[PDB]
Design an enzyme around this catalytic site. Structure first.
Site, mmCIF file in Angstrom:
data_model
loop_
_atom_site.group_PDB
_atom_site.id
_atom_site.type_symbol
_atom_site.label_atom_id
_atom_site.label_comp_id
_atom_site.label_asym_id
_atom_site.label_seq_id
_atom_site.Cartn_x
_atom_site.Cartn_y
_atom_site.Cartn_z
ATOM 1 N N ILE A 56 0.836 -1.193 0.000
ATOM 2 C CA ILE A 56 0.000 0.000 0.000
ATOM 3 C C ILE A 56 0.874 1.248 0.000
ATOM 4 O O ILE A 56 1.998 1.239 0.507
ATOM 5 C CB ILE A 56 -0.921 -0.034 1.240
ATOM 6 C CG1 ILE A 56 -1.730 -1.333 1.249
ATOM 7 C CG2 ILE A 56 -1.847 1.160 1.271
ATOM 8 C CD1 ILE A 56 -2.550 -1.551 -0.005
ATOM 9 N N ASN A 98 11.647 0.567 7.373
ATOM 10 C CA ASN A 98 11.883 2.003 7.494
ATOM 11 C C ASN A 98 12.930 2.506 6.508
ATOM 12 O O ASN A 98 12.778 3.607 5.976
ATOM 13 C CB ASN A 98 12.254 2.382 8.932
ATOM 14 C CG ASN A 98 13.528 1.709 9.445
ATOM 15 O OD1 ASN A 98 13.952 0.658 8.976
ATOM 16 N ND2 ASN A 98 14.106 2.307 10.470
ATOM 17 N N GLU A 138 20.428 -6.333 14.054
ATOM 18 C CA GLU A 138 20.355 -4.890 14.254
ATOM 19 C C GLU A 138 18.924 -4.591 14.683
ATOM 20 O O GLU A 138 18.016 -4.547 13.848
ATOM 21 C CB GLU A 138 20.736 -4.154 12.971
ATOM 22 C CG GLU A 138 22.182 -4.385 12.499
ATOM 23 C CD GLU A 138 23.203 -3.445 13.204
ATOM 24 O OE1 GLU A 138 22.773 -2.479 13.859
ATOM 25 O OE2 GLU A 138 24.437 -3.641 13.069
ATOM 26 N N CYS A 182 15.730 3.313 14.320
ATOM 27 C CA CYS A 182 16.169 2.520 15.467
ATOM 28 C C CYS A 182 17.099 3.288 16.406
ATOM 29 O O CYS A 182 17.080 3.040 17.621
ATOM 30 C CB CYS A 182 16.886 1.256 14.996
ATOM 31 S SG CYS A 182 15.854 0.126 14.053
ATOM 32 N N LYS A 236 23.842 -5.183 24.436
ATOM 33 C CA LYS A 236 22.738 -5.775 25.220
ATOM 34 C C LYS A 236 21.639 -6.247 24.270
ATOM 35 O O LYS A 236 21.939 -6.989 23.324
ATOM 36 C CB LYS A 236 22.311 -4.748 26.266
ATOM 37 C CG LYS A 236 23.376 -4.532 27.336
ATOM 38 C CD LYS A 236 23.541 -3.080 27.758
ATOM 39 C CE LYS A 236 22.453 -2.637 28.644
ATOM 40 N NZ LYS A 236 22.694 -1.297 29.282
ATOM 41 N N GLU A 242 27.333 -3.912 11.604
ATOM 42 C CA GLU A 242 27.335 -3.611 10.187
ATOM 43 C C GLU A 242 28.285 -2.455 9.922
ATOM 44 O O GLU A 242 28.628 -1.683 10.824
ATOM 45 C CB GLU A 242 25.925 -3.300 9.680
ATOM 46 C CG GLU A 242 25.102 -4.556 9.710
ATOM 47 C CD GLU A 242 23.730 -4.440 9.051
ATOM 48 O OE1 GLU A 242 23.148 -3.337 9.029
ATOM 49 O OE2 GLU A 242 23.220 -5.491 8.598
HETATM 50 N N1 LIG Z 1 13.215 -1.361 15.838
HETATM 51 C C1 LIG Z 1 12.038 -1.629 15.292
HETATM 52 C C2 LIG Z 1 10.838 -1.547 16.053
HETATM 53 C C3 LIG Z 1 9.683 -1.851 15.435
HETATM 54 N N2 LIG Z 1 9.657 -2.229 14.122
HETATM 55 C C4 LIG Z 1 8.369 -2.539 13.432
HETATM 56 O O1 LIG Z 1 7.293 -2.147 14.266
HETATM 57 C C5 LIG Z 1 6.500 -3.309 14.649
HETATM 58 C C6 LIG Z 1 5.940 -3.155 16.038
HETATM 59 O O2 LIG Z 1 6.952 -2.657 16.951
HETATM 60 P P1 LIG Z 1 7.397 -3.521 18.235
HETATM 61 O O3 LIG Z 1 6.172 -4.100 18.863
HETATM 62 O O4 LIG Z 1 8.296 -2.704 19.110
HETATM 63 O O5 LIG Z 1 8.329 -4.664 17.594
HETATM 64 P P2 LIG Z 1 8.966 -6.000 18.211
HETATM 65 O O6 LIG Z 1 9.724 -5.617 19.446
HETATM 66 O O7 LIG Z 1 9.683 -6.736 17.118
HETATM 67 O O8 LIG Z 1 7.629 -6.797 18.613
HETATM 68 P P3 LIG Z 1 6.440 -7.585 17.828
HETATM 69 O O9 LIG Z 1 7.000 -8.946 17.485
HETATM 70 O O10 LIG Z 1 5.296 -7.664 18.812
HETATM 71 O O11 LIG Z 1 6.085 -6.774 16.601
HETATM 72 C C7 LIG Z 1 7.463 -4.493 14.418
HETATM 73 O O12 LIG Z 1 6.750 -5.713 14.268
HETATM 74 C C8 LIG Z 1 8.183 -4.033 13.141
HETATM 75 O O13 LIG Z 1 7.369 -4.217 12.001
HETATM 76 C C9 LIG Z 1 10.851 -2.290 13.386
HETATM 77 O O14 LIG Z 1 10.816 -2.635 12.191
HETATM 78 N N3 LIG Z 1 12.021 -1.994 14.003
#
Ligand SMILES: Nc1ccn([C@@H]2O[C@H](COP(=O)(O)OP(=O)(O)OP(=O)(O)O)[C@@H](O)[C@H]2O)c(=O)n1
Ligand SMILES: Nc1ccn([C@@H]2O[C@H](COP(=O)(O)OP(=O)(O)OP(=O)(O)O)[C@@H](O)[C@H]2O)c(=O)n1
Ligand SMILES: Nc1ccn([C@@H]2O[C@H](COP(=O)(O)OP(=O)(O)OP(=O)(O)O)[C@@H](O)[C@H]2O)c(=O)n1
Lengths: 487, 488, 487, 488
Positions: free
Chosen positions: B25, B151, B250, B284, B455, B462
């Site tokens: 989309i 992103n 990462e 990030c 951590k 990278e």
């Molecule tokens: N550093 C990050 C944080 C978030 N996300 C994106 O935002 C979504 C939701 O964020 P979050 O719940 O913090 O991600 P996770 O910690 O990976 O948890 P979950 O498996 O519940 O999505 C992720 O699934 C991902 O698509 C990402 O790409 N990179």
């Protein structure tokens, strides 16, 4: 022996788990000692102790850390014979091995890393006149080492030496089969001046003590040596808990390739040393011996002659060069592999049974065993036995033997026997293994990184790279120009 | 709408054998950009066998022959920068003012960097004695897999594929289901540059299936993943249990920006703005915990309010737009929940905090730039990565205190300090538990600089020379020229 | 051709010396061109131009410098044939060499260093929590290269590529015998975007232009390629003047050791390529060929057979693979060495005279010449001839041949021919030479550092280390703790 | 009085065959400390053949065996620190408060450092193609020669011999004729530690004979020299003219100390003091051009004079003595000529400028701590190295000016800046043309840190990992496993 305790913060301390286990002398079946097992609260105490010790250790100068590790080396050289005898009682390996290899090569690695501490450097990178980057190789903090039972004190040294040299504290859990020499090492480090908490030793079982270490949120790295299956479990828990850095030294099914121009006396000598040292309980052993069809019969005769020269007996006798397996449960597993070889039609050239008679009936002895007429699909050929079982496989041409050598999930070691310059390098360059020997087997210098391809491991031990892998890189940009925001 | 997007296997687009598809989309309009085929288990195995054949051709070439091919790909990326940036904007919702200046430029910078380092990749030689020596080879891992995030889609595809290919490997890349389009374009560019067929294959799909099939495949030697912390743990578990694969991760962070008592507050505010609101907060490394001295807190808040008022949301292709919608309606919902948590836990809302409304916004997942102050270390918005445009301002009294609070987190990705003082800058930075540290700036990530997390924020690194080496494996070779002695 | 000028600050400029010299076509004796000679004022002008350009060059980003050098590579690839024809006219080397080697391998080194510029990094060293050190690899500034006449453009590239890649400006003085291609390179660099002044070219004579460069107080390093005697004069003057850093690539008398297990067809091919390429005018040539006594007669026959296929003639003909010497004065020196070999009792196997007839009478030709029955005291064996003169020496045992190979003041190259793994590495490890070839000769990859032991050189060219050696280290200590004075 | 000192060749003291001797003087009293035999041409030839034999034994040992032997020498040096320091004080005139804390401590620090690095000395491996590769060996040069200076006799002997021995070479060391005694002690200590006979030989003598015989010898592969700029050029010429030997030179300087406009003047004064009057000003890296902002010059002058008043000359074995006589009476005459040129050229004498007089000083080569101000860039005392306790203070107005003036010299050894400002410290230091740069300190020379001069102040470096490598020579070895193609 007295009930053995945990080693936390520079002293022996009782475990609060209420649980214990026994280590057996594999030559007699007698109990060597009752050993306390570290519980969940004991692991947390050890971590907090290690965090405090690491801060002191890292605050010292590089050369101050070097001198303390060098003092530990000197003590290990002095106590070599005492430590070797204890290792023999705990593992069943002959004193002729333990007094010449186990502590000597463990201390060689500690000595090596002690001297490299001052050479651990970051980098500096110019970007432009108004900005530059520099990096620091910082300690990971608290790391955990999980040892195996075949080279107990050597493994403890190979893990703790780079970890400590890099500025970390290590919590080490020895194998439940062989916990005793790690506790002595902890005392030796303290005697050398190692700050309290920098090396803690927690005996226990993998299902509990090992798991508590892999799960703890404040441990930054796990280093494990053991079997392939156990490694996968450890690497999974270490990931699901706190995303920890990982090193794994697992088993192998390493090939020894005998070339068509090889001297068969040298090849048989290499094959013997690649299969029957430490009663076959070595991860790097060349347990698939590829021999040209035209030489197979002559090679088999040469192997039989040398197997006959093997001297099992009193592990403290000078002439003994073969011991029992580390434990009776392990002998059962090795015997099942032997029976699998018989049932699939591999030809038993020699051995294949336990040893019997005065001095053997009470030990976990397996005779030196050779199967021949082996094929790539047999269980004894595909799977690591970790016992004294050599498999001999015929082959016809160089391209074929390279394909068959590489057609395995294991990837630890390999070797070729040939006097030919082009053949030696050409073959070795195509083999999928991390440790490669030309016209020899088994030597593992402190300078030489060692570890597995594919399912045989993650990362490396020894060499300069392993000192660096026990640090983490911090990149720092100094911007001296005016910062521009687009908002 | 665009033409239906297929898999890229062995130098050509090919239909998936899964029978499955998904849609990508436009996050600004809600329209379907394209229907995209999803790679099944059989497609992954085909991609692996293709990669195995291509890797052998690639590794057999000379070092400079590989360097020249990657450099041709760089030249194409420079020439098509604007076209690729516009595609990236359509797929991600990031403003063209960002994508045309950062995403492809810095992705190509990393490929250009590694292209030139290929001939410098060397092993070692170690003398043992007159009769024996050791030498080492840095051999390719073989087939490696990269799993990207949404992103910075093409930048991540470049940061993963450039060192992997430069080290002699083939890479199978799985882009995020949200943003698959630029990775397919990159695959074509590599082939046009002369990359052998199979060396870079692209498998769109969803994480639950295509991603898992890659992490489980027995003939893939390494997985490199960029994404969230929780998703990272799951990937690292399957990669180990399946075939004990090498891993790079990462992940996200909650990175601290420490403003010192001697900082100029205009500079501090500018850095905080760039550390929180670039790419609509979906970065990030963002400095989402801003620590300001108590004596300067009120003045700093005013300066933040002034700068937030200047953020320009609007047409993503207009030059003056510098703020976009979030990538999807589900992601905005998650950011909105964090904002509501901040309000209910007693943080003071300084600005923003609502969806954007009106013509040109109703079809996108827009959230206003949001700043909370009077924050405390126990609040949910302070402890957890939001991945949206939500800055948390925290007061502090002394340097020892701020270092403790900055480090008191499971995250470890980035950190920064603002101070003109020489001793303070290095002294504070050396104590922070983060892999990427910025002094008097934020966000710059030179190709030369290794980047990654402490951590829970990551495994491995990278960029930099070390990442080229980490895409090889060491083989140690002992040449024994003396007579071998057996003790039997 | 038109009268050739100096190249200073991105343009051709008339010399202020009032002096000129002629370069001769060695195939016809005709004057190729009149070339202006840089005087003391010209050198000072070049230095000030170089100082100005170097600051522009060093202020650019690393990748900006990389791209400019890569554009010069692209231009060199495109104009390979054009540059090679000019090189053949100036040097007398066949087009079959110059179109395949001289520019190709020159560009290869420029291409290599272009890619390494971003990898040039300093270091960071923690001392204690309150102090650390970091280093910068800074440009030397203005450096000078003095080329030789046997590989004019290749040497210009091998010196200028690492110098420019490290952020320096270079002033290059080609040999007065062969000045033409260096001027073409200067134009190519400017066309590629090199800032004005970064690569200036000053033709002239060694006695004047070279000395003015070695004496200039603002030149930080001299890199020289040429004969052993000329090298000593250059290195002394660079010292008595301004304590310059120095690199020297001088001549050799390199040994080619044929083992008892060597294939004699392979050995003969290697000996041919080690002696008669570029008409024997190669510093690394294996001009002492050691052969086992038992194989001496057969090797001589194989050498004679291969010498018979050497094709002298039109230097632009496809099948020509042998050229005249670079000049008639050089031929006179080569002929004197040949007559010394005859008078000292060496046996002439072939050649030993000039070539005669239509197309040869006007060129500086010497026939391919082989002496055998040579002994270690002979002049042709002890001294570099720099012509197509092979000396064959018989030997009996491995220890002897190593001693005799090493019994020389020269130290440039060496090689062994053997299929045996142990013999190849064991012999090579004992030879006192910087460039060692096993079962080959002459290949000089951009990655491989090359240079001389003993009287054959100072420093190295090529490889990563040569990029670093065109920088100087600055160590910077940051003291964040309180400074303590004892006064 | 001490016994007549002999040569040290092949693990024992041996009589010279030159028939010549010289005396070393105690600079505090003028008395003869010892008669010392001088090595002639034949003695040098004997020392080289001894070194050649010992080097073969030493290099044939394992890396860790060499490491252990050097570490035992370190342990002996630590145990005998005070005894060696007292001997050094007698020979040099430096206060025991210096020699017991610096000379042997930092000399042994460097030997200890290189002892541990021996096993990390590695070559490289470079793949060309499937059928060929290159590997390199870092081989010993063979026999190398070190020529020491008289200001830090045993430290220089250690800084030269430690990397040379650690790299597998033998070293023949020639101490300065002014200060030969501690080098002979070091030779005995190396043997006691297990150094094979011949690996470290010591040849006292004069530069015109023993030094020249070493620099000319055809079988010495490298010369390392520390001394004055003029002597360095003569040594470097003979070395080249004789047999094209590798060279390292650590020469003098006129190093600038730049006090920034935001510097604390007490800190700046303390650094200037340590940068000028340690070892009575006889240090190559001394900050003898002190650039002070015009607005702070008068106050800085006051703070210098106050600290100069605290300097304590006296009994060199007293704990509180921190200033000694110069090394010799001829050297004092040279320093006095420079002081007289400063007066006659119009520099303002703030203090000192004469010899010290009275009981306990008339028999020593004492010069009072001397400070000139109102100095200009054309003055002799500003342009030339004095190697005595003579500080020159120069006013300046702006940063660009002081950088240009700091760099407008043929010397290039050291430099420093005093400033609390992050940008100013790095920005200024990056522009200075010197090899050794100190920010807010002076004089510290860690074993890890390479040190040496730009321009006329040196060739090559000492200390750090690079200096271990610079005592080896690279052999490149190509293994060709494919069929060799001849065009003939
Ligand atoms: N550093 C990050 C944080 C978030 N996300 C994106 O935002 C979504 C939701 O964020 P979050 O719940 O913090 O991600 P996770 O910690 O990976 O948890 P979950 O498996 O519940 O999505 C992720 O699934 C991902 O698509 C990402 O790409 N990179
Ligand atoms: N390796 C070599 C040897 C010789 N020459 C050329 O051949 C000339 C004469 O050869 P030779 O006597 O070996 O040179 P040098 O030892 O330098 O002696 P001279 O001072 O006579 O030039 C040199 O000046 C130089 O032009 C060269 O370029 N490279
Ligand atoms: N950096 C220095 C400067 C001086 N000296 C000593 O002091 C003497 C005189 O100093 P100076 O004239 O500066 O030395 P050079 O420049 O070497 O000149 P000369 O040849 O006149 O001694 C030198 O010979 C040397 O013994 C030294 O060891 N190191």
């Amino acid at each position: 022996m007295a009930e053995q305790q945990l080693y936390i913060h520079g002293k022996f301390v009782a475990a609060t788990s209420g649980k214990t286990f026994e280590t057996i002398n594999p030559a007699t079946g007698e109990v060597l000692a009752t050993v306390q097992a570290a519980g969940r609260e004991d692991v947390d105490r050890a971590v907090k102790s290690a965090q405090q010790g690491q801060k002191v250790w890292a605050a010292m100068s590089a050369m101050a850390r070097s001198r303390i590790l060098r003092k530990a080396v000197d003590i290990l050289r002095e106590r070599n014979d005492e430590l070797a005898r204890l290792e023999t009682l705990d593992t069943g390996k002959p004193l002729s091995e333990t007094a010449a290899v186990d502590i000597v090569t463990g201390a060689d690695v500690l000595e090596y890393y002690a001297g490299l501490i001052p050479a651990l450097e970051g980098s500096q990178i110019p970007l432009r006149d108004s900005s530059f980057v520099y990096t620091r190789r910082e300690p990971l903090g608290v790391v955990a080492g999980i040892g195996a039972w075949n080279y107990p004190i050597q493994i403890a040294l190979w893990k703790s030496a780079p970890a400590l040299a890099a500025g970390n504290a290590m919590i080490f859990k020895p194998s439940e089969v062989t916990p005793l020499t790690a506790l002595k090492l902890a005392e030796i480090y303290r005697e050398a001046g190692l700050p309290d908490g920098v090396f803690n030793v927690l005996p226990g079982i993998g299902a509990e003590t090992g798991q508590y270490l892999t799960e703890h949120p404040d441990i930054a790295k796990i280093s494990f040596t053991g079997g392939v299956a156990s490694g996968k479990k450890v690497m999974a828990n270490s990931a699901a808990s706190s995303l920890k850095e990982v090193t794994m030294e697992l088993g192998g099914k390493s090939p020894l390739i005998i070339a068509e121009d090889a001297n068969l006396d040298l090849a048989a000598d290499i094959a013997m040393m690649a299969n029957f040292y430490s009663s076959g309980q070595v991860c790097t052993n060349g347990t698939r011996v590829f021999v040209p069809a035209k030489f197979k019969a002559e090679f088999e005769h040469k192997i039989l002659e040398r197997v006959g020269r093997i001297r099992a007996g009193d592990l403290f006798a000078d002439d003994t060069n073969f011991g029992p397996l580390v434990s009776f449960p392990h002998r059962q597993n090795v015997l099942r592999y032997i029976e699998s070889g018989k049932s699939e039609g591999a030809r038993l050239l020699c051995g294949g049974d336990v040893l019997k008679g005065e001095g053997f009936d009470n030990g976990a002895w397996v005779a030196p065993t050779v199967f021949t007429d082996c094929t790539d699909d047999m269980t004894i050929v595909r799977e690591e036995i970790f016992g004294p079982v050599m498999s001999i496989l015929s082959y016809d041409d160089e391209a074929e033997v390279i394909r068959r050598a590489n057609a395995t999930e294991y990837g630890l070691a390999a070797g070729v026997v040939t006097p030919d310059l082009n053949r030696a390098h050409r073959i070795i360059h195509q083999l999928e293994a991390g440790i490669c020997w030309i016209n020899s087997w088994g030597e593992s210098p402190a300078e030489m990184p060692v570890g597995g391809y594919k399912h045989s491991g993650i990362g490396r031990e020894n060499g300069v790279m392993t000192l660096q892998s026990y640090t983490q890189v911090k990149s720092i940009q100094v911007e001296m120009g005016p910062f521009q925001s687009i908002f």
